């Protein structure tokens, strides 16, 4: 029987992933049909997809039955070698074990925290992913096999026009001499997100190997065109950013796709690369492992994340890691009036929402294990002081009941202290950009202070304390009343009744414009934000039901130029 069980999980994974794929083959219609409510909508389902099957399995196991554990694994353990997507097969296994065991007691012997198999890198791939393309026999021709090449069932507008654009783009980028000697290896399958379907391929030059990315957009009224060509890693890293919804790309076997990618995305680690394609739950494992390597490889200890301490959350990081951990505090600051769940909800809501690459992705963790040896005194006292209910004492290890791991970014408030001159116009411009997108995305941030926004390597600005997070469809935007009387100017206390869930968008000025330096710019370019009229609109479109175009690139690059 024991070996039976392994079959049960293993049967299970195959089942889920099959489901995963069918959801993901869905897109093209979804893109074409132009229904974008579905498209976001569908996205959400996947999240639920992995869990159901895991959920389904245990119940299956439970009915069965009513020491060997090493045995069952080995059987699961023993069925891997053939199986191409072995990797996920483990995770799924791991995922199951924990549910069975309430996320406790896991140990390498007990389950798969590390892979059984020898490293993936292939003798060869069963079906090659992408198709090399060659200039000769025309190049301008070349773009022809490519577009006429791809699947989508729709008409194209000013096709030549787009075509011309790229050739101009590459030419400037490379120059004809270099250009003649470089070629493309485009993906078999486009990657789909939101309003656009993306086309991924390498661009290979005498110099080296370069990303070439075109994202396909649907014109108003259903015509098709290509917004831009991005040939820089910097742009690429961004378009594969961690602040954006998972790409929906059809991969029969993920592991190969990743390998192909890295050259495109030299920066991103394996755990990350997995996310973009969309295996979040798998990422957890790798990401978990990847950290594990860090722990071996450093003598640093856990410390409070730099920034402004958090009224809602307890957060910390190893000095040299790229991610921070967030633990909801046992008792919130008095001024704050929310409840634990709500917080719990917010984070989830974010995972299931388009993030616009303004909202950092999150990974929940349960019953996390830490070695007392690791935890610095200053932090420990803090944990016990404020998170005592959550943490559990286990000899030299402690178990943190709830957790989140997220990208570690320099907090916004801090960045402004450091930066100056042009660089700053650089930042403020962005934050201002951030709120509009988020707002447009029917998410209204709450605090809005810099303490609650983060800075990327690329300088991009992202939103992270999800305290006071809400849809903009449940908030009423009001205009501060002109004072009735000359006396009115000076009242500490507003003389008009404010219903809760009331927002006055001229109030921010004080918090935002405090620094003399910061203030004019915001005024300079970002006037709209404080004008309650504007927000009113933003929510108006949304109520109208519109989804607004987001470009994971600079406006300039947009191929208008």
């Amino acid at each position: 029987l024991e070996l039976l069980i392994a079959q049960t999980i293993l049967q299970g994974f195959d089942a889920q992933y099959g489901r995963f794929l069918e959801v993901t083959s869905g897109a093209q219609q979804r893109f074409e049909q132009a229904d974008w409510h579905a498209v976001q909508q569908a996205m959400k389902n996947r999240i639920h997809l992995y869990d159901h099957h895991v959920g389904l399995v245990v119940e299956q196991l439970r009915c069965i039955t009513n020491e060997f554990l090493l045995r069952v694994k080995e059987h699961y353990t023993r069925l891997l070698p053939d199986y191409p997507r072995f990797e996920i097969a483990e995770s799924f296994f791991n995922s199951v074990y924990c549910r069975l065991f309430d996320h406790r007691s896991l140990t390498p012997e007990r389950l798969f925290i590390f892979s059984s198999q020898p490293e993936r890198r292939f003798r060869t791939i069963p079906r090659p992913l992408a198709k090399d393309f060659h200039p000769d026999h025309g190049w301008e021709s070349l773009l022809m096999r490519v577009i006429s090449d791809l699947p989508l069932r729709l008409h194209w507008q000013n096709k030549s026009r787009d075509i011309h654009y790229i050739i101009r783009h590459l030419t400037e980028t490379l120059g004809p001499e270099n250009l003649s000697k470089s070629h493309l290896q485009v993906a078999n399958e486009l990657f789909y997100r939101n309003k656009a379907a993306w086309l991924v391929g390498k661009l290979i030059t005498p110099s080296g190997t370069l990303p070439f990315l075109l994202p396909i957009h649907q014109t108003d009224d259903g015509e098709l065109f290509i917004d831009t060509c991005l040939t820089t890693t910097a742009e690429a890293s961004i378009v594969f950013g961690f602040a954006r919804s998972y790409f929906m790309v059809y991969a029969p076997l993920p592991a190969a796709l990743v390998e192909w990618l890295r050259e495109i995305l030299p920066g991103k680690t394996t755990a990350e690369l997995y996310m973009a394609i969309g295996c979040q739950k798998h990422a957890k494992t790798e990401s978990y492992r990847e950290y594990l390597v860090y722990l071996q490889g450093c003598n640093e200890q856990f410390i409070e994340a730099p920034g402004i301490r958090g009224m809602v959350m307890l957060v910390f990081t190893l000095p040299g890691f790229d991610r921070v951990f967030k633990v909801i505090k046992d008792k919130f600051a008095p001024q704050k009036e929310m409840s634990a769940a709500h917080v719990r909800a917010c984070y989830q809501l974010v995972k299931e929402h388009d993030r616009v690459g303004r909202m950092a992705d999150t990974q929940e963790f349960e019953n996390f294990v830490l070695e007392k040896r690791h935890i610095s005194p200053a932090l420990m006292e803090l944990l016990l002081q404020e998170a005592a209910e959550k943490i559990t004492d286990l000899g030299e290890q402690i178990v943190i009941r709830h957790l989140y791991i997220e990208r570690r970014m320099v907090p916004l408030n801090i960045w402004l202290e450091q930066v100056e001159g042009q660089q700053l116009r650089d930042a403020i411009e962005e934050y201002g950009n951030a709120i509009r997108q988020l707002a447009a995305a029917n998410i209204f941030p709450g605090d809005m202070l810099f303490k609650n926004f983060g800075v990327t390597r690329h300088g991009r600005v992202v939103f992270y304390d999800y305290a006071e997070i809400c849809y903009m469809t449940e908030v009423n935007f009001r205009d501060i009343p002109p004072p009735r009387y000359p006396e009115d100017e000076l009242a500490s206390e507003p003389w008009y009744s404010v219903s809760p869930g009331d927002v006055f968008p001229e109030e921010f000025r004080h918090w935002l414009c405090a620094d003399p330096r910061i203030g004019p710019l915001f005024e300079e370019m970002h006037a709209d934000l404080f004008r309650a009229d504007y927000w009113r609109a933003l929510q108006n479109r949304i109520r109208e039901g519109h989804v607004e175009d987001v470009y994971a690139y600079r406006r300039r690059q947009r191929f208008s130029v």
């Binding site: 001024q335 408030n413 100017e489 500490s492 507003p494």
Partner: protein, 415 residues
């Protein structure tokens, strides 16, 4: 590392056995505040600094050390460090402090710097003395018959924000609780109804009441009055009276007068006799216009306090120049009580009655009774003389308008 520099000259005020020991070269922490705060605060320091020297022939001087909160802090300390924790320690370490204005968010999910300050120092008593000054424009015929000081408790009253919304399950859960287990039959229209809770605490009530009574004795006031709607609500408000008087008899040894509740407490330093009395809020409001001479000091529940304090001032025309402070077991903090009025920030237009006067509270509370006495002289002469800031002047007939900076002089001239 703190950006605030202890003055070399000054010495720490210390509190022991209740009565604070204040040296003659105090260090008084101060906060400029946002907006108009730049304007007013510099003035008050002059006025106050002037008064001290004049009064004590220069023997006593105040070393002022600035500490920061809430706009400056971003500039001094960090981009987003509004309320540095240095500050809270500092006020507490040094017993008394003074605060310029602060920005209070209008609505929403945004925290308030003042409450936080009140809240986190647990400043439980808020004292808002009211007095007319000469020639202030007023809506009532004989204001000058109005010197009163009002004590409120921020700690405990119905202003505790315990309530449940209508149709919220808990609310209906709550209603059920009283209705079935408890047996309340009074409630009408129970469905589709919302509930609130009000409490009165012996510890809370005594705590405040002890506070005034000590005050009067401290300042030779003539009576202490307990204001409550005792008759309708016996238990919470009324228990206020019952408790307060009782305090007098037990703690301060008051001797009954005629068996009617009222009592006379001897004042140890004074030898005068302070009266303790109670009157209904409903009536009391009526009474203040007709007979304000009668009442010197007041103590009342939290609610009566806003309505009454807020209410007295209008008669005295004093909202503009209202003065205030919040007080605590280990510290007292005296603040201007007005909006920042950004528009007029730095212009010099606005008039700092409130903030000076708050200083005036501060000094009395420091026992430097004589100096504060000048400030009142100054404020009085200056206003009567009809030389004043815009706010008043626009009202009066034949004033001489003054910038903010000068008026503070003007006060001095009249010192």
């Amino acid at each position: 590392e703190s950006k605030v520099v202890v003055p070399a000259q000054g010495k720490k005020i210390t509190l022991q056995n209740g009565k604070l020991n204040v040296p003659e070269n105090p260090i008084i922490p101060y906060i400029e505040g946002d907006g108009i705060g730049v304007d007013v605060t510099p003035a008050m320091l002059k006025v106050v600094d002037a008064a001290v020297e004049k009064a004590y022939k220069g023997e006593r001087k105040i070393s002022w050390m600035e500490i920061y909160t809430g706009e400056k802090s971003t500039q001094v300390y960090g981009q987003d460090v509004w309320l540095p924790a240095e500050t809270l320690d500092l006020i507490r370490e040094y017993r008394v402090a003074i605060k310029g204005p602060l920005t209070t968010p209008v609505g929403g999910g945004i925290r308030s710097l003042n409450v936080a300050l009140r809240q986190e120092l647990d400043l439980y008593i808020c004292l808002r003395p009211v007095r007319y000054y000469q020639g202030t424009p007023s809506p009532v015929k004989h204001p000058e018959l109005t010197d009163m000081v009002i004590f409120r408790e921020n700690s405990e009253d119905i202003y505790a924000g315990i309530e449940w919304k209508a149709d919220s399950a808990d609310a209906e859960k709550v209603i059920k609780f009283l209705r079935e287990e408890m047996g309340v039959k009074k409630i009408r229209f129970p469905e589709h109804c919302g509930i609130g809770i009000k409490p009165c605490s012996e510890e809370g009530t005594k705590r405040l009441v002890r506070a005034a009574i000590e005050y009067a004795i401290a300042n030779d006031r003539d009576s202490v009055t307990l204001v409550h709607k005792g008759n309708i609500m016996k238990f919470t408000e009324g228990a206020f009276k019952d408790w307060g008087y009782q305090l007098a008899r037990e703690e301060f040894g008051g001797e009954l007068i005629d068996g009617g509740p009222w009592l006379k407490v001897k004042n140890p330093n004074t030898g005068k006799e302070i009266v303790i009395k109670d009157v209904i809020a409903d009536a009391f409001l009526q009474q203040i216009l007709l007979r304000p001479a009668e009442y010197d000091v007041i103590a009342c529940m939290n609610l009566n306090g806003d309505y009454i304090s807020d209410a007295l001032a209008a008669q005295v025309g004093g909202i503009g120049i209202a003065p205030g402070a919040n007080i605590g077991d280990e510290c007292a903090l005296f603040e201007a009580t007005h909006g920042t009025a950004p528009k007029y920030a730095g212009q010099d237009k606005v008039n700092p009655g409130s903030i000076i006067l708050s200083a005036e509270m501060m000094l009395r509370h420091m026992g430097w009774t004589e100096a504060a006495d000048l400030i009142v002289k100054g404020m009085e002469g200056a206003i009567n003389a009809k030389t004043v800031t815009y706010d008043f002047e626009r009202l009066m007939d034949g004033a001489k308008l003054l910038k903010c900076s000068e008026f503070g002089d003007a006060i001095i001239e009249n010192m």
